[PDB]
């Protein structure tokens, strides 16, 4: 009761310390020093510096792809510090921790990505940029459908009107998933997940007393996240067999045998 409340506020505060761009901030921007808008080839060129990228120094779609890759490496880092905060996560065997994060991150990355999306585009560069859904759609095959499925999910997911104190627990539930392939000691993970799923349930009962069957609707979404990952991984296969394209080794470490 008051335990599950104290755990809700714990994860919310960890979430805030761990992720610098929150749904609260993203929504303020999307409904507002406006973001630079990239809607076509020439606006991509004008706004290229908005796209955070650090390297030594070449097709338009590859640069977007690299950009998304660049930022995902950082999302992984963020999610990891967050997991380290979910009570008992650090106490699990250190090989399971790696597997939970391994399969957990894509699901989390796409859940939080929804926060930065509306039906027309996605925030980039900590809200400094806005790249339109239509622009991404126009990129030559197979990069034209790289983002589209993500936008399709986001719109559905955003209609749930979840806020940061809700996603904090939802995200912690996903990490502590009990059916991740190759898990050694499955029991302790599910104990905490059971304890987080009940915390989520109460959090949705108080914070959203009007929207009925949200908890229900929310667990259903958690099944589509996995579908979106599946499509993604399958699409990466195509790209990897036709392009000449390079993947960060933190990402390669996650995709290997996934």
């Amino acid at each position: 009761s008051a335990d599950l409340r104290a755990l809700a506020k714990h994860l919310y505060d960890s979430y805030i310390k761990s992720f610098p761009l929150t749904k609260a901030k993203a929504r303020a921007i999307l409904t507002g020093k406006s973001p630079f808008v990239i809607y076509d080839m020439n606006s991509l060129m004008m706004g290229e510096d908005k796209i955070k990228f650090k390297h030594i120094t070449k097709e338009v779609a590859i640069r977007i792809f690299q950009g998304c890759q660049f930022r995902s490496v950082e999302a992984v880092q963020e999610i990891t510090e967050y997991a380290k905060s979910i009570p008992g996560f650090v106490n699990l065997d250190l090989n399971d921790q790696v597997t939970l994060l391994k399969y957990g991150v894509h699901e989390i990355i796409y859940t939080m990505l929804a926060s930065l999306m509306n039906k027309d585009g996605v925030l980039i560069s900590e809200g400094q940029g806005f790249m339109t859904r239509e622009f991404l759609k126009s990129l030559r095959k197979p990069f034209g459908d790289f983002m589209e499925p993500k936008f399709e999910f986001a719109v559905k997911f955003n209609a749930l009107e979840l806020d940061d104190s809700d996603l904090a627990i939802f995200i912690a539930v996903i990490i502590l998933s009990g059916d991740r392939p190759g898990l050694l000691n499955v029991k302790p993970i599910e104990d905490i997940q059971d304890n987080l799923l009940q915390a989520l349930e109460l959090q949705l009962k108080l914070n959203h007393p009007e929207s009925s069957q949200l908890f229900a609707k929310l667990l259903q979404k958690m099944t589509d996240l996995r579908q979106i990952v599946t499509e993604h991984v399958q699409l990466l296969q195509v790209i990897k067999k036709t392009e000449t394209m390079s993947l960060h080794p933190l990402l390669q470490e996650i995709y290997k045998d996934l």
């Binding site: 990891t80 250190l94 921790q97 790696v98 994060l101 391994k102 080794p249 933190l250 470490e253 996650i254």
Partner: peptide
């Protein structure tokens, strides 16, 4: 086996 993830957890 997953070196970067390990060092991120350490």
């Amino acid at each position: 086996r997953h070196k970067i993830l390990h060092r991120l957890l350490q």
